Swiss-Prot record:
Cofactor(s) essential for the protein: FMN
Modifications after synthesis and translation: The uncleaved transit peptide is required for mitochondrial targeting and proper membrane integration.
Source organism of this protein record: Homo sapiens
Gene Ontology cellular-component annotations: cytosol; mitochondrial inner membrane; mitochondrion; nucleoplasm
Disease linked to the protein: Postaxial acrofacial dysostosis: An autosomal recessive syndrome characterized by severe micrognathia, cleft lip and/or palate, hypoplasia or aplasia of the posterior elements of the limbs, coloboma of the eyelids and supernumerary nipples.
Gene3D superfamilies: Aldolase class I
The protein's assembly and partners: Monomer.
Gene from which the chain derives: DHODH
Remarks, miscellaneous: The identification of DHODH defects as the cause of postaxial acrofacial dysostosis (POADS) was obtained via exome sequencing, demonstrating that this method is a powerful tool for identifying genes underlying rare Mendelian disorders. Exome sequencing consists of targeted resequencing of all protein-coding subsequences, which requires around 5% as much sequencing as a whole human genome.
Cellular localization per UniProt: Mitochondrion inner membrane
Name of the protein described by the UniProt record: Dihydroorotate dehydrogenase (quinone), mitochondrial
CDD domains to which the protein is assigned, alphabetical: DHOD_2_like
Keywords annotated in UniProt: Disease variant, Flavoprotein, FMN, Membrane, Mitochondrion, Mitochondrion inner membrane, Oxidoreductase, Pyrimidine biosynthesis, Transit peptide, Transmembrane, Transmembrane helix
Organismal lineage: Eukaryota, Metazoa, Chordata, Craniata, Vertebrata
Molecular function terms from GO: dihydroorotase activity; dihydroorotate dehydrogenase (quinone) activity; dihydroorotate dehydrogenase activity
Length: 350
């Protein structure tokens, strides 16, 4: 479309030339929350997973709406599901600024926000203000996830996550915990017990979100514990602390997590491995460097039932959401799939 080209070639490069990345993100949150925003979802794109219907498989990844300020605007942008957070138990400021950096030559970002969070109570009251509106959205195929963090100074990480389950679990369709083997088992056992203690109408799925930076041994151990405990899904992946050869941006050596195109295929290969190690029985939300329908379908074919993006929104703006969905629909037809569902995991059946 013309909007896609105008955002990508003119408006976004101009905003990014005028505004540092944190200011630009804050402006994005404000515009989105007001619905100040520039594709028809077809039956082909619907996915049923995690106990819910998803009208389309393209979600906004954690971190864009850390405090739950823009959920309704994010649905208006075209996302099939929204994940807010990470939310920590107590409010905390996060790292000193600047704490996020653009790598324009790489179509990448590095960030070290450090879990800046309004905290559980503020977010709880924010979501309560729209709780029934969300119930209707979810029923109509637009679910809500809540990503749970821990405070920097916490001495008992499992208890921080347990608090998040109790406070925000009743308002979410799924919860996310970001992640020796016995220590992971202890943590997830406690999270699942707290989840099971909520009333059935307020009882969310629980997913584990992993980094792309894990050893083979770590991945094997996670797959084992996830299957043993009955964890509902995996989110694959967070940003990378690696720095692939070939980054050109002047800021490539800043501390933090790298996202965007240089992360893309590390993430896809991590999806592929986790799908295999769980025998395709554990739903995966695939995330990392998704900017096109091809990127989305590669992750779906590798094992993802849903995908998310963030960094592509920061470079290309709101039209990228409809772009990904249109390209994904077109590729699915070209490859002979009846819908997203038939493509999930398809590379493993070659
Ligand atoms: C500025 C920024 C902040 C983020 N904060 C969070 C967060 O609070 N919790 C989380 O699980 N992931 C966070 N992420 C990771 C994203 O959810 C996602 O896993 C990662 O960026 C890869 O997707 P992308 O390449 O499409 O950006 C953040 C990413 C960015 C760029
Ligand atoms: C690291 N980093 N760098 C950036 O420029 C951003 C960001 O969020 N940009 C950003 C922006 F500046 C916008 F104006 C919209 C935006 C939002 C609503 C309507 C129009 C434009 C946006 F989606 C964005 F992602 N993050
Ligand atoms: O807040 C952050 O720094 C943050 C959290 C997270 O989970 N991933 C990321 O890239 N940054
Ligand atoms: Cl920058
Ligand atoms: Cl360097
Ligand atoms: Cl680092």
């Amino acid at each position: 479309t013309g909007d896609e080209r105008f955002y990508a070639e003119h408006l976004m490069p101009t905003l990014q030339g005028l505004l540092d990345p944190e200011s630009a993100h804050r402006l994005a949150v404000r515009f989105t929350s007001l619905g100040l925003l520039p594709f028809q979802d077809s039956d082909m794109l619907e996915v049923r997973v995690l106990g819910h219907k998803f009208r389309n498989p393209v979600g906004i990844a954690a971190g864009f709406d850390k405090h739950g300020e823009a959920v309704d605007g994010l649905y208006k942008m075209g996302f099939g599901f929204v994940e807010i957070g990470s939310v920590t138990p107590k409010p905390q400021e996060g790292n000193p600024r600047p704490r996020v950096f653009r790598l324009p030559e790489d179509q990448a970002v590095i960030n070290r926000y450090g879990f800046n969070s309004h905290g559980l109570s503020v977010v709880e009251h924010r979501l309560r203000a729209r709780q029934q509106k969300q119930a209707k959205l979810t029923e109509d195929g637009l679910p809500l996830g809540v990503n749970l963090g821990k405070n920097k100074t916490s001495v008992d990480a499992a208890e921080d996550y347990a608090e998040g389950v109790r406070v925000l679990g009743p308002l979410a369709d799924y919860l996310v915990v970001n992640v020796g083997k016995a220590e992971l088992r202890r943590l997830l056992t406690k999270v699942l017990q707290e989840r099971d203690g909520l009333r059935r109408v307020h009882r969310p799925a629980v997913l584990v979100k992993i980094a792309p930076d894990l050893t083979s041994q770590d991945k094997e151990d996670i797959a084992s514990v996830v299957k043993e405990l009955g964890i509902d899904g995996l989110i694959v992946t967070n940003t990378t602390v690696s720095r692939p050869a070939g980054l050109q941006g002047a800021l490539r050596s800043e501390t933090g997590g790298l996202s965007g195109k240089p992360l893309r295929d590390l993430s896809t290969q991590t999806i592929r491995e986790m799908y295999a190690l769980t025998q395709g029985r554990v739903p995966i939300i695939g995330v990392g460097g998704v900017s096109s329908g091809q990127d989305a379908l590669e992750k779906i074919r590798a094992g993802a039932s849903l995908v998310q993006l963030y960094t592509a929104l920061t470079f290309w703006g709101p039209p990228v959401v409809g772009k990904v969905k249109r390209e994904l629909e077109a590729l699915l037809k070209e490859q002979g799939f009846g819908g997203v569902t038939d493509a999930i995991g398809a590379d493993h059946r070659r």
